[PDB]
Every structure is written in C-alpha cells, then in structure tokens.
Ligand binder design. Structure first.
Ligand SMILES: [Cl-]
Ligand SMILES: [Cl-]
Ligand SMILES: [Cl-]
Ligand code: NA
Length: 129
C-alpha cells in the first residue's frame, strides 16, 4: 500500500507514536517519507547481506527473521514479511523497540540526514487529526 501523508499521520497517531520517547508525530512521517516514499512493500538489500523492510526500512540483522541473514537476531520476534503488510501494526510495534534501544531515531539514517533539526511539523500541516 502507498499511504497518503495525512492518512499515514492518522494511522501512526492511533498506534501511539505521537510523542513516543519524545519524538513528535512529524518526525515519524518525515522518516517514512525518506525511508520508503510511504510504500509498505519497499525492500532494500545492504552490502553486509541484510535487507531493510517496509515503511520504516527495518533491518534483518537485528530486528526480524528473513531466513537469509546468517548470524542475525530477531529482536521483534517476527518474520520480516510481516513488515510489508498494508496494516502498519507490526512495523510500529517494532519501531517502538528500536527507538528505545539507546540511540533514539538516529537508528534511521534518512531521519538523521534529512529530518533531524528541520521543521518536521510541516509533515502534519493541514491534516485533520
Ligand atoms: Cl508527501
Ligand atoms: Cl494501519
Ligand atoms: Cl540519507
Ligand atoms: Na534476523
């Protein structure tokens, strides 16, 4: 599924991301835009052989099982295919574990390089929340 901007903001808010670990909703929308272009089916392979999955590009080295990342962990206790669903529940629940792991949203490279220190409230402007 390719979400609209305000449709995703509303889904993230219902699942408890607004101000989760102090990160306002626009941070989460900005990260999804630059990680996946709001597409739940996005995948990207990394040089180490791991793969990033779904709207928040969650990596198979630590967070999910894909059967093809040797020596990896599965800290979200999910198959990586669950992160590609039109229902963002599994992605949000796993993201809450990642952002709690000590480095905050710096775990997402596109957030650090394209969202951090910018006017992130612009990503939710005009939405009926
Ligand atoms: Cl947009
Ligand atoms: Cl959803
Ligand atoms: Cl980047
Ligand atoms: Na894994």
């Amino acid at each position: 599924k390719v979400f609209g901007r305000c449709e995703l903001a509303a889904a993230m808010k219902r699942h408890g991301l607004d101000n989760y670990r102090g990160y306002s909703l626009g941070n989460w929308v900005c990260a999804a835009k630059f990680e996946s272009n709001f597409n739940t089916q996005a995948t990207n392979r990394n040089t180490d052989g791991s793969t990033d999955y779904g709207i928040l590009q969650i990596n198979s080295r630590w967070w999910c099982n894909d059967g093809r990342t040797p020596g990896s962990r599965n800290l979200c206790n999910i198959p990586c295919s669950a992160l590609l669903s039109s229902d963002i529940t599994a992605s949000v629940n796993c993201a809450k574990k990642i952002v709690s792991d000590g480095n905050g949203m710096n775990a997402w490279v596109a957030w650090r390089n394209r969202c951090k220190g910018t006017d992130v409230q612009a990503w939710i402007r005009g939405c009926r929340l």
